[PDB]
Each structure stands twice: as structure tokens, then as C-alpha cells.
């Protein structure tokens, strides 16, 4: 028969559990968006201490028994990887609109017509969003700082935006590059995020160069150079142990001292081959013996070893240099230049190499002076979001007004097209359209001010044109035009949020059977 510990359930209870868990999870992270946001705290299963207010970064930190919540977490990380902001937005949209679907499901409905209503609904509202799409040129720095401040308005570090926002844009350009003249690339892995504890927020900014937490490898080397000569090697200077085994049979009177002489001579010849194209700094990820450094002290090289592989990539990209593997292949074109300034400064109680670029960089490294690793992590996540949106606007010069007004605008548009169409799916259609504006009521709750009157006035104002930009002012719980407030969000972000929430709803509204307790095979 069937095995013992396998429980199998069906009927209404499974969808009941699904919708209840969906609304539950949506009812734990509601109050974190808009200017009025309330800063959450959570503890990792390990025992760490974190605090954040953006969705998936913390929703990754929950273990659950029910499957639907794991599906929710996967949706959250999908949104995190795709857009990096408004993570809570898609979650709450999915939860509220599933809640709307629930009541309708109770009333004799079957999921086939429901999912058909989703497909037609999403098609219609995406088309409407295309209609209301307006492009704006991306060549203005003031625009980009405005959008960064709009995004960070949901974040508590908005205080320093005046400087901080600008910092973001800097990286977005000073890493920007294109392979062979095409396929423009902006690598965040090349935008290494380093944070030095202590210091005010203002002292933190992007440096037109590369930052590494290392120091000098020998006291008697210069600790400052204006223009060093850059070479990168990927082989150790210590004796290489070959591949096979020989076990030399010392038969004659003496070969051991001869062996040591040959060893030091090989080291000498390779080191002098390196010196042949006179450098000023040699950098390598491998360890180095004393003899190579001693030989380099005649050439006064900086002699830095044991660097990180991605750090090698970043430094090479910034300098524009190349990477060698043999001293013998050393040639001219590989040695890049652009090291406008080099320092080894003692910061706090740790050393850091300060190479400052003079020429064009194609990779950035960040100094982050703060008060604690958790706050620095917060600002790092938020600046990552900043460059994310900056590059998103770079790729697509589209904008629509922020503050959630477009939700109600497209809701009214779908209302009119539901009037145009004929069917019974118009009911769930308009219902999920009403689910769309869960955001503004959430914003009002964050404000804690009057709700119904402003909601109704907003609703009346948006059923006609000329008000689509006009939105909800969360600063003081009022209604204003967004042509002047400044909150503006890219088209692709809201596109992805809409698609993600709708597809999650479509996924969660098909199951009929659950079987639990089976074994991996």
C-alpha cells in the first residue's frame, strides 16, 4: 500500500492555508515603504544581530514549515536580483491581490477563469503602462541625483544624500566601460565595497582609484610614490616543485652547494628578467621568498604580494595594465600606467594601500567610514541599490511618477476597459485593480493620518487626466502634484514588480493536492 508517515490532504483547506500564509507574510512587512518608514530588526538563526527595512534581504532570514512561504521567499529573491528596490512592494501587492482572489474563489469560482482573468488583466495594464510611459534624457546629473534621493527617501540614510547620492553616480561612470568598443559593461564585482569602521558618514565616498587593505612587505622600501610602474604576475617567485619526481642520487664529491647555487641563480635570472623592463611596483597573488625582494631592492620596487584574484581583475581594469605569468614573456604592452598617486597610510589601527588614479578608471573601490559593521552594511546595500537604479535608468531612459499614483491611474484605466469588455471575469478584474492601491493605504498608515477622505479625493482626481502625475504626499499626509516633489521611478522596475506579483499569484492558485513526508530517491 502507501507508506506509513506520508500524509495526503486535499479540499478547501489547502487553499485556505495558502491564502492565510500569504496574507500573514504580507502582514509582517507592510510598514516599511515611503518617506514614513519604520526600521525593522531581526535575528539570524546563527545568532547574529541585523536590522533592515527592505524586503528580501531580511525575508531570506526566515525558516518556515509551509511550502507557500518558501515560494514567497524565492519570489522575494527573484525581485532582489532583478530590480534591487521596492522588494516589499511586490510582496505586499501579491499578498493583497491574493487576498482579493480568495473571496472570489469562495464564491463558486474555478481557477481556470481566474488565471485567464490574470492573463488578460496583466496584458491590459502593461499596455496601459506603455501608453503612460514617458522617456526623459539621462544626460543630466541633477536628474540622477534627484532619482537617487527619491529612492533613498525610503531609507534612513537620506540625511547625507546631498553628498551620498552624488557618490553613487560617480561610480556608475568611473567603472563604466565597453569590451572592444561595444557591449557597455558596469560590473559591481569591479565596484568592490570596502568599509573602514569609525569616521563620519561624509568622509565616506568613492575614490578615483583602487583601495586594498594591505601594507608594505619590507621596512626599507619607500612608502610613497607619485607614479609607480604597474606589473601583475600570476606565478610565485619561489622555486616551483615541477611535476614529476627525481630524487637526485648525489654520487660525486659535492653537488648540494651546487644545487643551492643553481637555485639562487634561477631566482636571480628570473628576477632580473622582471627588472629588465624596469618597474616600480610588482604585485602578485602568490607568496615570494626573500631572495626576489633582495634582488628587487637594487631596482627599488614596491614588491607587494598575495593579492585577491578579483582584486587583481579590478586593479588591472583600473590601471589598464595586463597580467603576465612568466618573467620571460615580459614585454612592453603589458605594463600599464595611470598610477597617479600611491600611498601607504595608517588608518585607525590598520594599513591600507592608497593608489590614486590619474587617468580614466574603469573600476571603483569605496571607502565607507561609519560607526558599526551593521550600519555600514545598511549603507552598502542602499548604495548598491543606488547604482542599480542608476544603471537601470542608463539602459532605459524611462520614468513615471512615484508615490503610487500610477497604481490608481492604471486601475481606473482597467476600470474603463472592464466597462468596455463583456464577461464575468470583470469582477475579479476590477477587484485586483482595487487590490493594486494597497500601497497608498499602507503609506497613510505609516503616516497614521486620515485615510478615507484623502483616498476618495485621490480616486476622484485620477479618474480624469491631467492628474496622473499628481500623487500622495507622505511627508505630511497630503495630496500634491509629483511634478515638483521629485519621487520618480523607472518603468522597468514597476514592470517587473507587476509581473512578479501577478505570476506569483498565478502560481499559488492552481494547487489541489498536497503530499508530505516522502523520501529523496
Amino acid at each position: 500500500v502507501l507508506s506509513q508517515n506520508t500524509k495526503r490532504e486535499s479540499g478547501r483547506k489547502v487553499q485556505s492555508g495558502n491564502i492565510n500564509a500569504a496574507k500573514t507574510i504580507a502582514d509582517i512587512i507592510r510598514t516599511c515603504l515611503g518617506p514614513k518608514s519604520m526600521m525593522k530588526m531581526l535575528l539570524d538563526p546563527m545568532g547574529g544581530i541585523v536590522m533592515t527595512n527592505d524586503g528580501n534581504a531580511i525575508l531570506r532570514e526566515i525558516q518556515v514549515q509551509h511550502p507557500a512561504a518558501k515560494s514567497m521567499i524565492e519570489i522575494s529573491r527573484t525581485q532582489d536580483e532583478e530590480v534591487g528596490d521596492g522588494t516589499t512592494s511586490v510582496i505586499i501587492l501579491a499578498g493583497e491581490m491574493l487576498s482579493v482572489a480568495e473571496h472570489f474563489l469562495e464564491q463558486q469560482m474555478h481557477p481556470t477563469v481566474v488565471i485567464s482573468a490574470y492573463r488578460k488583466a496583466l496584458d491590459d495594464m502593461i499596455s496601459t503602462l506603455k501608453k503612460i510611459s514617458i522617456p526623459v534624457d539621462i544626460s543630466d546629473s541633477d536628474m540622477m541625483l534627484n532619482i537617487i534621493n527619491s529612492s533613498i527617501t525610503t531609507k534612513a540614510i537620506s540625511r547625507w544624500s546631498s553628498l551620498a547620492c552624488n557618490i553613487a553616480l560617480d561610480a556608475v561612470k568611473m567603472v563604466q566601460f565597453e569590451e572592444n568598443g561595444r557591449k557597455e559593461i558596469d560590473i559591481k564585482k569591479y565596484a568592490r565595497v570596502e568599509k573602514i569602521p569609525g569616521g563620519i558618514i561624509e568622509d565616506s565616498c568613492v575614490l578615483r582609484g583602487v583601495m586594498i587593505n594591505k601594507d608594505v612587505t619590507h621596512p626599507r622600501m619607500r612608502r610613497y610614490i607619485k607614479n609607480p610602474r604597474i606589473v601583475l604576475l600570476d606565478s610565485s617567485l619561489e622555486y616551483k616543485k615541477g611535476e614529476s619526481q627525481t630524487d637526485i642520487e648525489i654520487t660525486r664529491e659535492e653537488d648540494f652547494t651546487r644545487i643551492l647555487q643553481m637555485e639562487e641563480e634561477y631566482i636571480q635570472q628570473l628576477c632580473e628578467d622582471i627588472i629588465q623592463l624596469k618597474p616600480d611596483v610588482v604585485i602578485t597573488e602568490k607568496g615570494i621568498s626573500d631572495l626576489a625582494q633582495h634582488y628587487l631592492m637594487r631596482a627599488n620596487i614596491t614588491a607587494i604580494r598575495r593579492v585577491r584574484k578579483t582584486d587583481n581583475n579590478r586593479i588591472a581594469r583600473a590601471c589598464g595594465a595586463r597580467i603576465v605569468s612568466r618573467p620571460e614573456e615580459l614585454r612592453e604592452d603589458d605594463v600599464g600606467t595611470g598610477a597617479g598617486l600611491l600611498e601607504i597610510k595608517k588608518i585607525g589601527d590598520e594599513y591600507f594601500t592608497f593608489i590614486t588614479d590619474c587617468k580614466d578608471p574603469k573600476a571603483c573601490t569605496i571607502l565607507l567610514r561609519g560607526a558599526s559593521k551593521e550600519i555600514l552594511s545598511e549603507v552598502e546595500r542602499n548604495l548598491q541599490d543606488a547604482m542599480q537604479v542608476c544603471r537601470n535608468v542608463l539602459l532605459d531612459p524611462q520614468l513615471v511618477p512615484g508615490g503610487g499614483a500610477s497604481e490608481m491611474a492604471v486601475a481606473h484605466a482597467l476600470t474603463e476597459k472592464s466597462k468596455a469588455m463583456t464577461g464575468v471575469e470583470q469582477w475579479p478584474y476590477r477587484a485586483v485593480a482595487q487590490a493594486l492601491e494597497v500601497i497608498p493605504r499602507t503609506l497613510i498608515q505609516n503616516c497614521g493620518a486620515s485615510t478615507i477622505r484623502l483616498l476618495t479625493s485621490l480616486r476622484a482626481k485620477h479618474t480624469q487626466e491631467n492628474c496622473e502625475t499628481w500623487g500622495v504626499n507622505g511627508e505630511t499626509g497630503t495630496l500634491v502634484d509629483m511634478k515638483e516633489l521629485g519621487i520618480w521611478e523607472p518603468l522597468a522596475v514597476k514592470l517587473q514588480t507587476y509581473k512578479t506579483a501577478v505570476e506569483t499569484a498565478v502560481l499559488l492558485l492552481r494547487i489541489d493536492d498536497i503530499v508530505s513526508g516522502h523520501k529523496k530517491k
Binding site: K214, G287, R305, R306
Partner: protein
């Protein structure tokens, strides 16, 4: 209510018990998590070659002491690497190595008749093992000259001796039968004899 009043007075129902087992198990589970960092500096012998990713401070007292113990360990282990070729001694001397073979040194006393892929593959596996463990005395020979008219249906028989005491036995192919038998399984069996400490899946 009534049950807990019972509990204060009597023990006729059991329901408050066994809630300490999982408690202690979780306590030990959290406790055993510091063993990874307790011996981080106490296991690797290449950490000196791991400069610039292992150094934060050098107290030069216990750490030079660690070099001293490490070098003593290394010299002790590499002074014993003397083997690696399975050897064919004759039956005339046999009494002199069944007994005079050194105390504290394991002896894998292999007996065989060449010709069957069973014995040939076993000889191959042990010879290859000699390349890995040169601290183990391997012996191979023809059992006929070791034991007179030995039954040829009882080969290859593995013998494990030390100080004339049989510690492990593996008699005939009844425990090695099959060309599918491999390197690691032989090493596993000899480890199970108590001579070697390694790890294997099965």
C-alpha cells in the same frame, strides 16, 4: 487544571517528562560549534607558507613552540618512510620474519599463487598501496614454499601479524572475490585491521 493538581500531588499520569533530552542535545549541538576555530591554528602545518592571509599577530612564544612540535612530528614521521616495494623472501628464512619482524611494526603477510586474476589484482593493489604507506612491511611469496603442499583452493589468503599474534584474517577469495574489488576497498580493510587511519565512503 486537574492534571497539574494531580502532578503536584501524584505521579499517576506521566506527561511532564523527556523535555530535557532535546534540550541537552541542542546544548551540545551549540557547544560543538567552537571546535572548528579552536584548532584552526593547531592543525595546518603550511600556515607559515600561508602568510598575508593567516597573520594578525605573532606572540613568538606558543607559535614558535608550534613550529618546534611540528618539526619534531615531521622528522618522526619522515624517518620511517623506508618501504614501497613488496618483496619476495624465501620459505627457508620464513621462521625469522614470522617472529623476528620488529615489535610495533605491522606486517601484512600476503600469501599467493600467481596466475589467477584474483591473486594478480590483489598483488597489484598491495604493491600500489606500498607506494602510499612506506611504513608497512609487505611480504609476498609462494605459499607452497612457505607452507608445504598448501591447499591451492585457499588463496589469496591475507595474513595480519605482529609479535607472532594474528590480529586480522582474510582467508581465501571468499572475502575478496570479484574483479570489481578496488584500491580503496583494500585500504579500507587494512585500516579496519587497526593498522591505518583513513576515511572511505564504503
Amino acid at each position: 487544571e486537574w492534571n497539574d493538581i494531580l502532578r503536584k500531588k501524584g505521579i499517576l499520569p506521566p506527561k511532564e517528562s523527556l523535555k530535557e533530552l532535546e534540550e541537552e542535545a541542542e546544548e551540545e549541538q551549540r557547544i560543538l560549534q567552537q571546535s572548528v576555530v579552536k584548532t584552526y591554528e593547531d592543525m595546518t602545518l603550511e600556515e607559515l607558507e600561508d602568510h598575508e592571509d593567516e597573520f594578525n599577530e605573532e606572540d613568538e612564544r606558543a607559535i614558535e613552540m608550534y613550529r618546534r612540535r611540528r618539526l619534531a612530528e615531521w622528522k618522526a614521521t619522515k624517518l620511517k618512510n623506508k618501504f614501497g616495494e613488496v618483496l619476495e623472501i624465501s620459505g627457508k628464512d620464513y621462521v625469522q620474519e614470522v617472529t623476528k619482524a620488529g615489535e610495533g611494526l605491522w606486517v601484512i603477510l600476503h600469501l599467493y599463487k600467481q596466475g589467477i586474476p584474483l591473486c594478480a589484482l590483489i598483488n597489484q593493489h598491495l604493491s600500489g598501496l606500498a607506494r602510499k604507506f612506506p611504513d608497512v612491511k609487505f611480504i609476498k611469496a609462494i605459499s607452497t614454499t612457505c607452507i608445504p603442499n598448501y591447499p591451492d583452493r585457499n588463496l589469496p589468503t591475507i595474513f595480519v601479524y605482529l609479535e607472532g599474534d594474528i590480529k586480522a584474517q582474510f582467508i581465501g577469495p571468499l572475502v575478496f572475490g570479484g574483479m570489481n574489488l578496488t584500491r580503496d576497498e583494500l585500504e579500507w580493510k587494512l585500516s579496519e585491521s587497526g593498522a591505518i587511519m583513513t576515511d572511505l565512503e564504503e
